[PDB]
Amino acid sequence: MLTDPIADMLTRIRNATRVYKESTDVPASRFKEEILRILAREGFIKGYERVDVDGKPYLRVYLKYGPRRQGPDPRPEQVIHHIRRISKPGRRVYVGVKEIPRVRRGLGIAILSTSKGVLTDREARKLGVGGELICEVW
């Protein structure tokens, strides 16, 4: 069974990005969508859309990269470097606004799901309401 989808989705991404793929499907789930939504907004991905495969709902996720470098290994820089799951099943992690983290001394983001909704840290800090950390990303 799919132990933890989210972990799974972030992984699917973590993976495809490394091989430098263009798109990358993922089993559809509101929440999963809600996450992506932020990724898109924060500018980590060329966005994404709903699709169908075998007849079941997936989420084409269009990946984003840098520009060809020079010299050895002309592989682009990953728009998305780091990107890990935090609160996994059997080890849920919860923070109260006062506890939300400084993802990458500023340059990163942290996706919290809150009673107000899924949202970036600063977003949270803004509405002032912590919740469940979901994934240091940067």
Partner 1 sequence: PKKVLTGVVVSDKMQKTVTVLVERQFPHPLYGKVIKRSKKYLAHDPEEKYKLGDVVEIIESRPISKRKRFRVLRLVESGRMDLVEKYLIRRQNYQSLSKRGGKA
Partner RNA sequence: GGCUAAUCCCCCAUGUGGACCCGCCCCUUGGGGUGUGUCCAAAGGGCUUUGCCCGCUUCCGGAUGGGCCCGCGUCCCAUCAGCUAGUUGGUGGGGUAAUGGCCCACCAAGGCGACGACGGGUAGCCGGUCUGAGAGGAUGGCCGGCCACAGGGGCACUGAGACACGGGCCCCACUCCUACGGGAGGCAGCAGUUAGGAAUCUUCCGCAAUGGGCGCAAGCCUGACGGAGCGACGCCGCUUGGAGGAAGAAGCCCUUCGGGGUGUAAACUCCUGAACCCGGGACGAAACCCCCGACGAGGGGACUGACGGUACCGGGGUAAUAGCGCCGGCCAACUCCGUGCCAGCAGCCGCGGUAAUACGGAGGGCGCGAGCGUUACCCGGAUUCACUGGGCGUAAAGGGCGUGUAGGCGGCCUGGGGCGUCCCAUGUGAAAGACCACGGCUCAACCGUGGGGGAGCGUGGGAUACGCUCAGGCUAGACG
Partner RNA sequence: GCCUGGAAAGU
Partner RNA sequence: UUUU
Residue numbers at the binding site for partner 1 (CB under 8 A): 90-93
Alpha-carbon span 20 to 96, nearest angstrom: 37
**What 3-state DSSP class applies to 137?**
strand
Sorted by sequence, the CB contacts under 8 Å of residue 15 that are 6+ apart come out as: 24
* Residues written for the chain: 138
> Where does this chain touch RNA (CB under 7 A) — which range of 41-49, 75-83, 91-99, 101-109?
91-99
Cβ atoms of residues 10 and 88 within 8 Å:
no
Q: Which of 10, 36, 44, 113 binds RNA (CB under 7 A)?
A: 113
Q: Where are the beta strands (DSSP E) in 25-123?
A: 45-53, 56-63, 94-95, 111-114, 117-120
Compute the least distance from the CB of residue 92 to partner 1, in Å: 7
* 41 vs 64, beta carbon nearer RNA: 41
* 92 vs 126, beta carbon nearer partner 1: 92
> Where does this chain touch RNA (CB under 7 A) — which range of 10-18, 44-52, 53-61, 67-75?
53-61
What's the DSSP call for residue 78?
B
The option from RNA, partner 1, none interacting with 4 (CB < 5 to 8 A, set by class) reads RNA
Enumerate binding residues for RNA (CB under 7 A).
Answer: 1-5, 27-32, 34, 55-57, 89-90, 92, 94-98, 113-118, 128-132
